[PDB]
Symmetry: D2
Subunit: 447 residues, 4 copies
């Protein structure tokens, strides 16, 4: 069987790996239009901050190692079109310009997403950067040590926007994060968390300008100013981390796409075309908290989807098990983690939830290593099934979100978690741990 | 209603708390034979090691604060007998010697356990100590700084035995842990883990003498030598942490007891006598990994049982949800956590299990903060349902065991966990985290 | 020649060492009335604080190692009298009670000093301790971890008093230092320094009660209260570190003594009796800052004097070179060092001095590791010769006081030090280092 | 009086400061040919290593702050010639090209030195850098984070060469230091020290190629290889830190110069021309260790000379007091300091010296914070006067070299230092400190 896998990032890569597991027999071709195989953009901050020194080590596969296992790797080769009917694909070697047709028995694509750019005045002024991929990573590292960069403006206060802000602030630049949303990191955390995070960032030379629409970039040749409807800010460098758009324009009319460009697929990763499967940022995923499907552009999700596509290559036998949307990140001294439904997700979904937040030391008061911890447990009003949770502390308590991810999937209730067995040892936690305590507060609130 | 609660430790205390939640109306009497209310023996190591300076802060309730909420606290008062038929109890004020009878409508007891003592020659030689309670804690702290103590022998290589060994080694004493069992901490961890832990402890002046039966203590007036069948060891202080025995002798014939002294109770915490409930170390608990019941002397378990007894005070409506036996502890630079069935538990239960162990860095290789992590996933041969897990690292990854505790309870399989949604961010974990990786190895092993 | 050396501490010990250097031929007898050879009381704080665990390692010679080099060590043997005329000494073996006479050709004694005790009401109440020697060190360590000790009162705010206060405060006790003097550590530092040190100690649970005379100790059997003329303080333990008295009572009439008990000696360490030499705390020493002689009870001084006595054993050929009184100590986060004349010494001596104090970061402002440093340079009004200096910082800059000690001895001026060659490297200091800057300020002040 | 000061670095700057002290009356003109006033090249490593983030903060004066005190600052203006006879100077505004003549009553010049460049094949290949000044500092920082730089070769194993090597190694590059000299840092330290330092650097990805003459640079357009007589090395960047040459070519025939270009001056900083004074790297300085004069290109020396020139502006009244050549630097975990004559200096001077080296823990053995320290004391064979010393440890003991600098100046002997008063406190040092111990070993060696 000849299987073509498009993309060398998380969705494409785990598909190649699963093909080696379940189909060592097959002729596998792996296509990547860029010059570098499997760069991990998730590690870009570790690199920019100087924890990881070599940009080229921030990966998880070389093309050269995949060829050693019998995979035909074509870097700098773009798949330009699909002819599903004919079971052919058009590919173009970007080094030589030479186009060719390639045949397949099964095709798995993981096209990913492209950074959304603000189509406003001054869009083509120099030093308005993006943050995705190796090329942007090295350019951004050039700018961290550039003595001509003093003020950095990052547009977008999400995950990437805050990583960019932290890296440039730590590097010694004055940063302003600008967004129309009124809370940084609202997709991940609720207000009692984002207010502490805002305060923490402000203590580190970051202004966070919420509720502002960017209107135009000003400057002679290069940016010099970012102008919003409420204010104007000096900028020597801009980092645009506002959103992502599915890389699917080329597929319009070949495959069925949702109005926003995401490829329509079922729980077996099959597209509208037989033998064409799609995964990753460009697709929707089964979201277990609300038994629905949403778009969650995370590496974890792309990875599992890539494997499940190979699992269903010849017949629909393994339905995808669903995800809870879990995240975790450190923002200066704080480490947070989140899974399931929080305010922003509940509003997008139109789901009424109930919740309790416990903010107290996570160790018993006699232990001087005690530190304050925030934990919010979100649950269903009717069934009291666990729908989400968020936690934060200067202590690293993030691995607890893994327990909540399973509780949601398992449809456990607040009474289940209130009395759930979690170990106790006073150097690590309180008699009723962080999850137990929140759940007991939730049953108290439902008396 | 007049409710009498015996014991001011974890089982007794959470019962008083739950009575305040669900029965603020009742006359509550709380009895404790010792002079101190709610001392936390779980924090004794933090104290001995000098992280917590005041022995009296290692608690979670004062008698004086409970009386402020209308509970009648009787410290230094021992319940000597129960007359269930009459719904009376015999109590004795140990300060005054004056016995009296007390009436009740419901009685909840949490008698706990007593350290098992080796009935061998030299048993009454001075400086053979135990490690449970406030009185022993202050005596053991006296010995950590005693210049006449050089060699310390701790008998019992379990949880308490190793805490005692670490505290005395850190304090500067030569320690030898002695046990007939061939592995330290075998109740919690399997051999690939306990070999690393043995090596770590040996690097810290601790000899671990496994496979040896202690025969006699030698010394003139005070210990001077501990003699086993394979060897003899100098000892200035001995700490006996070999086991626990249910504090139920006084109840024989009043309540039905299992052959080892544990009080027979059902899933609603009711004893063989109507209106008498029992919880904690002295009882068995529903153990969800193998849908059975076992004795697991842990604070977590006592706490939840104490609350469930009050929940079922007037009628059996809340069946206990079960526990997985979870633990966690740091042993010098390593932190481990464990839940469910491991080798020792499988042998006690006679259950055949299958398992995989993954030992590799928990962060991707390009990140210099990467450290080695051990994770073993135990599962059912037939169903591949998750039955247990153990993990260890110098990095603190223990909160992940909370996810596994729920996976076992939920009867999740290795395929469920292989593709379970766990967040990825390269400062915190690898694309497929520690649980995902072990579960993928387990499906690989079942191909 | 038979040389008898009295005392196994700093003066006695360096004399034995120098006898081995210059007289390997001689029969040497080394006497010590205590049970332990060469304990270092200078290391008692490191021990009490738990940095050094074994009390017996805080030494610099064993009796057993000295006998290996042919010295006859008599521990537990007290020299009770000297008959200089006859060249005999009376010694008593304290184990056996048996007195004997011993002959000598030369005798070198280093009797040291005894802690001064306040002869007031309640002087014989239990738990009023002292801080000198091994026996007191182990007793004080017993008290650091005693749960019955809550309030500790140390009387005397000098070097020892503050070590005692820091050790007990760090151990978790409430401390009050009491003294009639109005400044802690005034013998070492001037007010701009002791005010910062007072503030630092107060931030660590230490009250410093200056200007108060202790009148009586109160308590039933054991101390319970310390009463001064201005106030009364609860005390579970008292540490008396107010002064020292020469251990010379037994010598009155045998050797000429100054009115305060110090043995009269010349610059060659000879007493009023031929062939009897005396050194250490019990003598005066040449003090080069003011070309006078003062009593400075420091180990450094005893050590050098011990060697110089052997140097002048047969004839006065090596006049003692003099000392500057140098000290250094850390008090919580601060490290200070001092040499020469400061306010208190100038008042005792009646010497008019001039001085400048510079308080600024010790590194150039662009270097974020910069920290504030205090340096005071004291000089002669007329000649501008360097008479003393004091420095302090949370950075350890103490070794600079060694340069000043030599500058005073050499009779260097403020102009000499202003332009003295001290290296510059911006990770270590400013272009004009801490000494240069103070000296330039002193010439500025003499314009 | 109109005083012209040439150069805004250490010699020029301290002259302007001293003019403000002693001559606030005068018209002062301060000339600097570069665009930046008072950059501190001594702080370039702190900057390259990322401890100091802003290149522009690494200074000690702004032109703008000096004008505020009435000094006429002319940056970007080069003094092209001196007409001493006429008391005029030719200056050229490098921005406008306009030359002019300026008059003076007194002229003080601090021209400094220029990096020596190897006139070999390939000298004009791109990426062969130097390390002096702001412009080179920012270029070198560009290269630390450049992903195309892998191998860095620094030619010259002196102070600057090793700073450059450490900065690039810490930044993640493979470094090779190349020099004809057989020991790195030989001008500062002797072999027992430089062998430990070599080993330390090799443990950090630095090859140190001693005894090799560089013959040619190879590469197409940019360096690619450095070829020596014994070997060839790949190089993406070269840093040339081999020497300095006096910036005096323009003065030949105006002022008398030594054969190597240094300006001839007396102990009052006067040149061969009346009213023209010269200081800094371009001059010789009185070197007190051997009562001679040598060229020591250090900031300390330039600073003091700058002030002494103003002190002797109207008449020779303040003879320069001399320097000892003191240095100090950290090289990875080690901190060393040095003053006076060591092997290399003794060979240049032709002076026979004697020396002892003590290598042992600097704290008493019972204190676990003890660390190994190296100290070498160099002295005169005949008089035993202190001629130099070197010390090194992972503990920072460098401030002790300040004591030795004064001992040499004062002509103290090994017997003086053996019994010199240095404080003792066991958290800081041994009874006989690091200087005392070395000096006692030196008297032992002269028995
Ligand atoms: C800065 C940053 C930080 C992030 N951090 C995290 C994190 O910490 N945790 C987490 O879970 N997620 C994180 N993510 C999200 C995660 O990286 C993405 O969800 C994941 O990369 C998506 O994988 P994908 O395969 O669907 O697409 P992509 O990553 O977009 O990869 C698609 C690849 O296919 C190639 N390609 C596209 N079209 C063609 C074509 N026609 N022919 C040939 N090649 C083609 C592209 O060049 C690209 O290399 C982060 C993302 C960014 C940018
Ligand atoms: C050193 C040590 C470390 C531990 N660490 C941990 C840990 O880190 N995590 C964890 O989960 N568990 C830990 N445990 C176990 C945990 O402490 C026990 O499981 C828990 O205390 C049991 O609670 P209990 O109420 O059943 O009994 P107990 O703790 O035994 O308390 C019974 C109380 O009732 C009183 N009493 C008994 N009989 C009478 C009577 N007749 N009348 C009046 N009063 C009476 C007793 O004085 C006692 O105070 C540790 C135990 C020890 C000793
Ligand atoms: C807690 C403390 C901290 C200190 N810290 C420092 C410091 O950090 N730096 C510093 O420089 N100094 C310090 N000192 C001071 C220093 O320890 C003393 O200056 C030094 O010990 C004095 O030495 P000595 O030989 O004169 O007398 P002592 O130390 O008093 O020793 C005399 C010895 O001789 C014995 N002896 C006396 N009479 C007889 C006899 N008749 N026959 C036989 N044996 C006899 C005694 O038992 C004693 O052991 C400190 C002192 C104390 C108490
Ligand atoms: C990387 C490095 C690290 C160092 N580290 C240390 C250290 O840690 N400790 C230490 O003591 N020393 C150190 N030094 C040495 C110290 O910096 C020099 O000794 C000192 O700078 C010399 O001062 P100067 O005034 O004589 O000359 P320079 O520093 O050479 O300055 C001369 C200035 O005058 C200007 N100038 C020259 N000619 C003219 C003209 N004709 N007209 C107008 N302007 C002119 C030049 O542009 C220059 O700015 C280091 C040097 C370097 C390069």
């Amino acid at each position: 069987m000849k299987v073509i896998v498009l993309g060398s990032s998380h969705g494409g890569y785990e598909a190649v790996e699963e093909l080696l597991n379940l189909h060592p027999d097959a002729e596998i071709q792996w296509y990547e239009k860029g010059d570098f195989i499997s760069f991990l953009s998730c590690g870009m901050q570790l690199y920019l901050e100087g924890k990881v020194k070599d940009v080229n080590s921030v990966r998880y596969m070389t093309g050269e190692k995949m060829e050693s296992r019998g995979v035909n790797v074509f870097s700098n080769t773009e798949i330009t079109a699909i002819q599903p009917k004919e079971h052919q694909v058009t590919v173009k070697d970007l080094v030589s310009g030479e186009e060719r047709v390639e045949n397949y028995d099964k095709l798995i694509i993981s096209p990913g997403a492209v950074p959304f750019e603000l189509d406003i005045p001054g869009k083509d002024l120099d030093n308005i950067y993006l943050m995705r991929g190796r090329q942007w990573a090295i350019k951004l590292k050039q700018k961290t040590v550039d003595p001509e960069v003093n003020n950095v403006v990052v547009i977008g206060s999400g995950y990437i926007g805050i990583e960019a802000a932290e890296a440039f602030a730590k590097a010694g630049k004055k940063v302003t994060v600008i967004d129309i949303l009124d809370r940084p990191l609202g997709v991940y955390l609720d207000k009692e968390f984002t207010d502490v995070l805002t305060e923490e960032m402000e203590a580190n030379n970051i202004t966070i300008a919420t509720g502002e629409t960017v209107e135009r970039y000003e400057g002679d040749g290069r940016v010099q100013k970012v102008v919003t409807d409420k204010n104007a800010y000096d900028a020597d460098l801009v980092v645009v981390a506002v959103g992502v758009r599915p890389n699917t324009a080329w597929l319009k009319g070949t495959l069925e796409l949702h109005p926003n460009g995401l490829i329509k697929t079922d729980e077996y990763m099959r597209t509208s075309e037989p033998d064409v499967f799609a995964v990753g940022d460009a697709t929707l995923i089964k979201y277990n908290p609300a038994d629905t499907e949403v778009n969650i552009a995370l590496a974890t999700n792309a990875m599992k989807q890539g494997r499940f596509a190979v699992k269903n290559l010849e017949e629909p036998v393994k339905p995808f098990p669903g995800v809870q949307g879990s995240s975790g990140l450190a923002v200066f001294d704080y480490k947070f983690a989140s899974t399931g439904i929080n305010e922003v997700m509940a509003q997008k979904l139109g789901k009424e939830t109930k919740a309790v937040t416990v903010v107290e030391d996570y160790l018993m008061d006699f232990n001087p290593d005690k530190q304050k911890a925030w934990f919010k447990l979100v649950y269903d009003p009717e069934t009291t099934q666990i729908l989400g949770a968020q936690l934060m502390s200067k202590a690293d308590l993030t691995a607890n979100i893994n327990a909540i991810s399973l509780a949601i999937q398992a449809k456990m209730t607040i009474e289940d978690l209130a009395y759930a067995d979690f170990f106790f040892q006073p150097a690590f936690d309180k008699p009723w741990n962080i999850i137990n305590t929140a759940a007991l507060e939730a049953v108290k609130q439902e008396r």
